[PDB]
Structure 1
Amino acid sequence: TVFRQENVDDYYDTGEELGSGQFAVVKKCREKSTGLQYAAKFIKKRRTKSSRRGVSREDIEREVSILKEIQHPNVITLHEVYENKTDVILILELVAGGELFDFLAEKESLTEEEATEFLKQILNGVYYLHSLQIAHFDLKPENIMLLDRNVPKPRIKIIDFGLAHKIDFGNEFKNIFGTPEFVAPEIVNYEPLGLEADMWSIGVITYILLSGASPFLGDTKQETLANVSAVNYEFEDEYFSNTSALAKDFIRRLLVKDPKKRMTIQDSLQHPWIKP
């Protein structure tokens, strides 16, 4: 449905360009009556119902109507929608932590204890969703973001609800894409689904977040996939020596071919490794 059709300019004053994908750019921005620094996202549509550059309405209003439903901690929220001829601009809850994967970057990995702290953040963030029949599918380092790269202990967020889809029932359509290094087998092999899939991304992240070494990535695109499909991980010595067998067990049960036979949030949010 319609959102807002005017010139945000008379209401929002943009600024720095945070990030720009393939059909969008992220720019900070204040308001007129709040000074509440935000950042409108504009995603490039398609001139004609057959363009090759940008994205169609269905996906927009979709990512919108899927977002416009949320409200929870580690997951960005939605303020309003501002639409103009060229694009639909997402007035997202301003974030700036960027890639946790980066903040700690200079620091290779972390420390299991300090580690899980972050693990246990998304695990909680994804959860809310799961029980809401809305997997993400895109859960990848690159999306993970902190709310202040400065606060002593950071509170991450969740975004990029592109693949995200109501798994209520859904005419789980559109296929569309995923990244050659983290999509769950099912994706690699004729598009299944599942929030049980989100716990595959997550089983991944939790292994990288503590090792600085992708498990499947290969020299080439296709060649990698050849790695997910089969699920052929390996704890690298020089890369894991200082790792808790327990810690291991975790990720391990997360990199399993048959979905059902793979863990899930609930279970996962109680694994001995996450024993508060």
Structure 2
Amino acid sequence: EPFKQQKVEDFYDIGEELGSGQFAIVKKCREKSTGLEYAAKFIKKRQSRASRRGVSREEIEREVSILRQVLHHNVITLHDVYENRTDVVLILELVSGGELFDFLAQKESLSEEEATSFIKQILDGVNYLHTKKIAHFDLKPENIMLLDKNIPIPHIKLIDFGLAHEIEDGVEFKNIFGTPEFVAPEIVNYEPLGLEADMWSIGVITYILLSGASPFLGDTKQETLANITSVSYDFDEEFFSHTSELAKDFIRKLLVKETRKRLTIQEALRHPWITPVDNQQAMVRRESVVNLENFRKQYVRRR
């Protein structure tokens, strides 16, 4: 339905900053009428076409269209949409538990069983999207949030659908976007895009989650892109000495250039590392640990 033309401030209390993109600013908010808390995403609108600042009507309407479709316990929910002269404001589910990687860095120990549990949460959210032919296109640790960091096993919420796109039958979608470190070769090569790009990103997130190291990240953006296109990564024993074989197989099957060869979200969920076939493989996963020393070190370096 239409965006609300009323003043956001007239119906919402505005609190602290939660974050921002280049073209958006997210703030904690409360609906005066209900007393309920949400997050208000203020997206700056473009003036005409050649504007350096602002997001286009098409891109704003796409994000809204996608968010209005999604109702899943591992995905952020949309509440309301407002529009003024400068901004289109998205009223979203309040997510305030911080980044998953922040929480993990806090743990005294982490087993691969625990790790897979969090990974499955992401996989469950992505599956829901992919079933609806929706690609997220921006899967990275920043966009992997939690509701509450104070329950034993926190619940993951996938956020920021600014780059999300509905995959159409027989329509070629080609674009260059996202954070270099996490993008699939087809993005870099300006080649047809689909749901496969998300699966590559999951492989990168898993890699970092288990090691602290990033598979393709170089000294510069130039190096990073060269590594991605040539698929040049390793399981160095400095970072992967504790890692199980199935964990490496899971990643190895996700970091594949050929899109048709890469695991689908369904194939990823069935994979023995996520889903043990017998008690043996379940116990191997249970006893395998993540070196949080390396994970923590590298995460603080991201701060």
TM-score for the superposition, normalised by structure 1: 0.95
Which residue does 1:74 correspond to in 2?
Answer: 74
Partners of 1:38 and 1:206 lie apart in 2 by 30
Aligned partner of residue 232 in structure 2, secondary structure: coil
In the alignment, does 2:235 pair up with 1:235? yes
Residue of structure 2 in register with 1:62 after alignment: 62
Q: Is the 8 A contact 1:134 1:168 kept in 2?
A: no
- Kept in 2, the 8 Å contact 1:200–1:254? The answer is yes
State the one-letter code of the partner of 1:178. Answer: G
2:298 matched residue in structure 1: none
CA distance in structure 1 between the aligned counterparts of 2:67 and 2:25, rounded to whole angstroms: 18
Q: 1:44 to 1:170 in 2, by over 3 A?
A: farther
* One-letter amino acid matched to 2:64: V
> Structure 2: 5+ residue runs without aligned partners?
277-303
Pick closer, same or farther for the CA change 1:224–1:239 going to 2, 3 Å.
Answer: same
Aligned to 2:211: 211
2:166 matched residue in structure 1: 166
What residue number does 2:24 align with?
24
In 2, distance between residues paired with 1:232 and 1:102? 27
Instruction: For residue 25 of structure 1, give the secondary structure of its aligned residue in structure 2.
Output: strand
SS of corresponding position for 1:181? helix
SS at match of 1:266: helix
Tell which deviates more after alignment, 104-113 or 152-161: 104-113
Deviation at 1:173, TM superposition (A): 5.2
Paired position in structure 2 for 1:95: 95
Q: Distance in 2 between matches of 1:109 and 1:166?
A: 39
Give the conservation status (yes or no) of the 8 Å contact 1:199–1:263: yes
What is the distance in 2 between the residues matched to 1:158 and 1:172? 26
Residue identity opposite 1:185 in structure 2: P
Q: State how far apart, in whole Å, the 2-side matches of 1:147 and 1:268 are.
A: 25
Equivalent residue letter for 1:261: K
Aligned residues: 276
Q: Give the distance between the partners of 1:48 and 1:170, measured in 2 at CA.
A: 31
In structure 1, stretches of 5+ residues that fail to align are none
CA-based RMSD: 1.7
Alignment of 1:1-276 (within 5 A): 2-106=2-106, 110-169=110-169, 175-275=175-275
CA deviations on 1:193-229 (whole Å, 9 max, x unpaired) are: 1112211101111111111000100000011110001
Compared with structure 1, are the counterparts of its residues 221 and 184 closer, same or farther at alpha carbon in structure 2 (3 Å cutoff)? same
- Aligned counterparts of 2:103 and 2:89: Cα–Cα separation in 1: 27
TM-score (norm 2): 0.87
- SS of the aligned residue for 2:49 comes to coil
Cα shift at 1:134 = 0.7
Checking the alignment, whether the CA contact within 8 Å between 1:165 and 1:172 is kept in structure 2 is no
Amino acid at match of 1:153: I
- Does structure 1 conserve the Cα–Cα contact (< 8 Å) formed by 2:76 and 2:92? yes
- Of stretches 174-183 and 79-88 in structure 1, the one that deviates more from structure 2 is 174-183
Counterpart of 1:192, as a letter, is P
Bigger drift between 108-117 and 254-263 goes to 108-117
Contact 2:174–2:192 under 8 Å retained in 1: no
d(CA) in 2 for partners of 1:160 and 1:108? 30
In structure 2, relative to structure 1, the CA distance for the partners of 1:88 and 1:108 (3 Å cut) is farther
SS state at 1:239 partner? helix
Alignment partner of 1:13: what SS? strand
Q: Distance in 1 between matches of 2:220 and 2:108?
A: 23
CA gap 1:130/1:118 in 2 versus in 1, 3 angstroms: same
Give, as a single letter, the amino acid of the residue that structure 2 aligns with 1:96: S
Q: Deviations over 1:159-212 (max 9, x none)?
A: 211221000338555725221111111111013211122111011111111110
**Could you tell me how far apart the structure 2 residues matched to 1:89 and 1:45 are?**
10
- How far residue 241 of structure 1 moved from its aligned partner, in angstroms, is 0.4
SS of corresponding position for 1:272: coil
Q: Do the aligned residues in 2 keep the contact of 1:188 with 1:229 (CA within 8 Å)? A: yes
Deviations 1:219-267 (A, max 9, x none): 0001111000111110121201001011111111111110111111111
